[model samples]
Target: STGSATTTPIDSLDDAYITPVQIGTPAQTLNLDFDTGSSDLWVFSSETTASEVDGQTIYTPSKSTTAKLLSGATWSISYGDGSSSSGDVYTDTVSVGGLTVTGQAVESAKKVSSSFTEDSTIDGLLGLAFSTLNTVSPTQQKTFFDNAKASLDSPVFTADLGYHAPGTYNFGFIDTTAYTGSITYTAVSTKQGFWEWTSTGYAVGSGTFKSTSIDGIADTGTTLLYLPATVVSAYWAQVSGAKSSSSVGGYVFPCSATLPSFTFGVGSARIVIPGDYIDFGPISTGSSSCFGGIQSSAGIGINIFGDVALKAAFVVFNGATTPTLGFASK
Candidate 1:
């Protein structure tokens, strides 16, 4: 049987898809961001200082009957977006939908940066990347997927993130009905502990596809698509009044400007982000400025095919034999 769970949007069409997960024996429910870029399952815990937690849910590991404290095992993780958390360790029964993995390493956060401390939407993060990316003291921990993969028919997962719609993350199986057309597969370079792959080229508006490859990562946790400096500049140039705005961060353009569609090549499949998708949320409620969903990944080195890009397609992370990514237009 396949282990599948529905993911709800953190926002209608903007931020993230969160999944409900049960932890410990007594079963405390937590809404977690299933992130593909990182490999650590961390949550707000009883150990968190009151002042550090603004108005978010807390997981008291001590209160759970099945929670086992892993003494001396600690974990500290920071994200590309500057969000960070550090916590103590515990082994608990973690379940997602119909799948259950006992003795899963659960990092209970005692300290969090403003990014998480003030955010009220999510309680934790469940990493879905390779086990080698897990961050823990002494020995690294295995993610819930890694622990349960042995009992499943196939070690695979499908991410069907929709645009302002309900999506599902399926484990150990792939739903053929979710996507149309045959899946185009590409070899993944997991050297960075991310689903890293190269995009053959891209095209802006009615422009021809430029034959320049961009090394990128598919990250579900990241909200925007990050491309190289030149690529980002080229796309924004098509707009009448667009420029890099230090005040709002990234490229901002007049809300009245007509935006063009952007397309990224993945093998033979060219996934396109509609013109409307590039215009992210307005800069402010009263402002006419809007942030560009596509930005430069200059300093970060690798481009990030975040939710903005992934949402345009149905993604499959194939784990058997050599790791590869399957993409099909939703």
Candidate 2:
């Protein structure tokens, strides 16, 4: 089951990153966001009202010879921004690159939030997290990775997400060429179905590292890096024009201002996020105001190392032998 797929970025530096995936017997292709934060492979489908789908592609199960309805099973999902989707389930053939998995649950969306509906490019979400977190009702569903792991050369996947550049999601095997330096392995607590771990400490710019155990998840699905308020405020203070803006729903800074590098301790190693990535472009086209990728994790208990941080490094999602995450500089 060794295979890898290309990931085309659609502004994960601020918006989202998406990749292509195929479903059904003949392979109906759809661009999906490969989300490690959630565990449901939900897609816009025939069940969705035409008014609710917007400009995205739809999955017509009737056209797929291999799709079978999973009676009484449904899936519902919500994102950090409160965007959500709900749908019925279908067991079908799902393929990623050369690896194909049969009887995989493909949730056909009946309802999707305005955020999802208006997100024109991506047709769905392909969950790369542990299957234990899948949202299918009646009985939990297994993810594409879970279903195909046994046949893989190694039950692992690597996410090489880049800032405004095309990266890749490698499955079943790790390409040595993707990263530099040694891969620092850190054990993850997957009981909640996430690649979660606590950082040893943090620092802003060239400041001394402060000892603060920050529990967080490595979420590729998320667009920004969210930390606790105390830490977020500390970083924001360093930027001259930085201020919390209700309009953008996060901190915004002048595009011309220089930002400080943010660092977090991972195991014994440290992962540093460049300052440039923090100025996540402008809040809107033609607007000079830019949003900060680093925000406060107010509602959510745990911090999230999203695309801003992930793009700066090569990430390995190791599922075999107690789920662990390996990080290396790109």
Candidate 3:
């Protein structure tokens, strides 16, 4: 009824988190990105073009006795960063940690974008968003969480992300030891097929909290935190040499600058992100200027609370009739 899995950051910058997933009869394991931003459980597979294959582990459905082609089912997914993947669908026995979902749709990649092929850290993506956002055509498929929810002790899952170390994902039950303080709950809007919510306010370092409602999605797939231009600008202003550079593609500052911690409200509870967390590292090897983890979301339309934000707290994705999101300090 309940299960747990480890989520390890792939790079030194904590660019992406990878979790191992088992697929098919004998359980061919592949490291996948647990993406709450999108809704397509896709993988690099035997059907993928050889030219596009890198060091990623492949899921060969043909090798599994339980694997069955889903007739003419097909799926395609494109991300905001321009990375994409598309392929046919197959129903197979899939499991994460110890949670099993029989007849789960396993999208096998026939094509992948250059960005995907270049990143050898992940073999695929396991979507945890609402099923309505699934890309499968004709008959949309449900996410692994949605399919397994019925058998779980509770229809909820939690993410405890880490900065430089490994974290955990728990299903059905909340591990009290993983976090501190009472969890602050908030209503979620599934209209956008995302775990979207409005935050209460924000503050830079010891500055007073500015009470403003900022709408954003909790996207684990994304690497950086994106906020309104004003909030981002205000945060960087505290740094002596911080500037938005077109050549660097975002706000970059002197690596030795004294960075300010960021704070945001969840209901009445305040979560603080340490200054070092926002210093995402240098723009390039040996570069004196470091890229800021927080960026402006002016053109993106929607703000995103990514790893930079989530790593500071424990998050619960409650799937009750009236879904809600829970945040707890750690």
Clashing pairs in model 3? Answer: none
Tens-digit lDDT track for model 1 on 1-330? 468899888875568888999998789988999998899999888898678887777788878999999989999998998889998899999888888889999999989998887778889999988889898988899988788887777888888887777789988887889988888999899888888999989999999998878889889889899999999999999999999987777899999998999999988679989888787767888789888989999888779999889888889988776889989987
lDDT of 2 by residue, 1-330 (tens): 687788887754547787888999778899999999988999999999778888898889999999999999988888777899998999999888778899999999999989888889989999988888898998999988898888899999999987778888988988999999988998799988899988888899999898888889999998889999999999999999889987678899988888999998877888888998787777898777888989999888779998888888999999897788999987
Judging by TM-score, tell me the better candidate of 2 and 3: 3
For candidate 2, the per-residue lDDT at 136 reads 91
Point out where model 2 deviates above 4 Å: 12-14
lDDT by residue for model 3 over 1-330, one digit each (tens)? 987999999988899999999999889999999999998999999999999999999999989999999999999989989889999999999988899999999999999999999999999999999999999998999999999999999999999999988999989999989999899999899999999999999999999999999999999999999999999999999999899999988999999897999999898889999998898888999999999999999898899999999999999999988999999989
**Residue 279 CA displacement from its true place in model 3, Å:** 1.5
Relative to the unseen true structure, what is the C-alpha lDDT of residue 241 in candidate 2, on a scale of 0 to 100?
82
When 2 and 3 are scored with lDDT, the better candidate is: 3
Alpha-carbon lDDT, every model: 0.87, 0.88, 0.94
Q: Which residue ranges in model 3 land beyond 4 Å of their true spot?
A: none
Candidate 3: Cα lDDT at 132: 95
TM-score, structure 3 vs. true: 0.99
Model 3 shows how many backbone clashes? 0
